[PDB]
């Protein structure tokens, strides 16, 4: 498309991730407000979810079930909170430092960028302790994707990189983005395409699968965007935080 819509969240300050599930609804960290607020589709007003104690908030991530996953980055842990429930759950990380993005995959594992340790961390549901994915030499890493197959994507962002792991591999792969100056969010769709924002170029850049083709969406206006999401139709949110408002396009 070469349409973007801005969507009717409000009084947003420096977000920072978006993510949508399956019914399309659409949750921002309103990083600058220390709240996390969410916008069914079609909706016409905002709902601020009932997180407790908040601080500068960065990762956002939604299950198939609706629960809603988020990094509270200034308390370094990162907490759940399941639909229709008004009581979080903290999540047993440890030893977290500033950490940024967060994903679930289909078993509900959730995948956290220890952005201050240099570190990918992972949980599994139902387990009390966290595991460190094999990634070496990483620079202030901050999103996090994961596949169906369960390979991890990170943004190496100190790094101006983005690398993958498979699951249970000790070998981590640079994919070939070009241009990058310095990567924020990621995400990756069911066709294998990942998606990446571009701080330094205010751009959204996706990587074909296989062909290897980079091409930048058709956004405009964007300001050091952050976050990025695709939801099951191809559409993709970004974060556009230098400009507090989230965009969305579709393919």
Do not use: E, I, M, W
């Given at each position: 498309?070469?349409?973007?819509?801005?969507?009717?969240?409000?009084?947003?300050?420096?977000?920072?991730?978006?993510?949508?599930?399956?019914?399309?609804?659409?949750?921002?960290?309103?990083?600058?407000?220390?709240?996390?607020?969410?916008?069914?589709?079609?909706?016409?007003?905002?709902?601020?979810?009932?997180?407790?104690?908040?601080?500068?908030?960065?990762?956002?991530?939604?299950?198939?079930?609706?629960?809603?996953?988020?990094?509270?980055?200034?308390?370094?842990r990162?907490?759940?909170?399941?639909?229709?429930?008004?009581?979080?759950?903290?999540?047993?990380?440890?030893?977290?430092?500033?950490?940024?993005?967060?994903?679930?995959?289909?078993?509900?594992?959730?995948?956290?960028?220890?952005?201050?340790?240099?570190?990918?961390?992972?949980?599994?549901?139902?387990?009390?302790?966290?595991?460190?994915?094999?990634?070496?030499?990483?620079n202030?890493?901050?999103?996090?994707?994961?596949?169906?197959?369960?390979?991890?994507?990170?943004?190496?962002?100190?790094?101006?990189?983005?690398?993958?792991?498979?699951?249970?591999?000790?070998?981590?792969?640079?994919?070939?983005?070009?241009?990058?100056?310095?990567?924020?969010?990621?995400?990756?769709?069911?066709?294998?395409?990942?998606?990446?924002?571009?701080?330094?170029n205010?751009?959204?850049?996706?990587?074909?699968?296989?062909?290897?083709?980079?091409?930048?969406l058709?956004?405009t206006?964007l300001?050091?965007?952050?976050?990025?999401?695709?939801?099951?139709?191809?559409?993709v949110?970004?974060?556009?935080?230098?400009?507090?408002?989230?965009?969305?396009?579709?393919?």
């Amino acid at each position: 498309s070469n349409t973007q819509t801005v969507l009717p969240f409000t009084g947003l300050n420096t977000p920072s991730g978006v993510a949508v599930d399956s019914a399309g609804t659409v949750y921002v960290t309103d990083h600058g407000n220390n709240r996390v607020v969410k916008l069914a589709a079609g909706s016409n007003t905002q709902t601020v979810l009932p997180f407790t104690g908040l601080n500068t908030p960065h990762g956002v991530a939604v299950d198939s079930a609706g629960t809603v996953y988020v990094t509270d980055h200034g308390n370094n842990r990162v907490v759940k909170l399941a639909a229709g429930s008004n009581t979080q759950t903290v999540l047993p990380f440890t030893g977290l430092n500033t950490p940024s993005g967060v994903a679930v995959d289909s078993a509900g594992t959730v995948y956290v960028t220890d952005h201050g340790n240099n570190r990918v961390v992972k949980l599994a549901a139902g387990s009390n302790t966290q595991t460190v994915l094999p990634f070496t030499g990483l620079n202030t890493p901050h999103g996090v994707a994961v596949d169906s197959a369960g390979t991890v994507y990170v943004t190496d962002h100190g790094n101006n990189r983005v690398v993958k792991l498979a699951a249970g591999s000790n070998t981590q792969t640079v994919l070939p983005f070009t241009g990058l100056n310095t990567p924020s969010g990621v995400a990756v769709d069911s066709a294998g395409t990942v998606y990446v924002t571009d701080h330094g170029n205010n751009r959204v850049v996706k990587l074909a699968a296989g062909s290897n083709t980079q091409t930048v969406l058709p956004f405009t206006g964007l300001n050091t965007p952050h976050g990025v999401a695709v939801d099951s139709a191809g559409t993709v949110y970004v974060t556009d935080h230098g400009n507090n408002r989230v965009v969305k396009l579709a393919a």
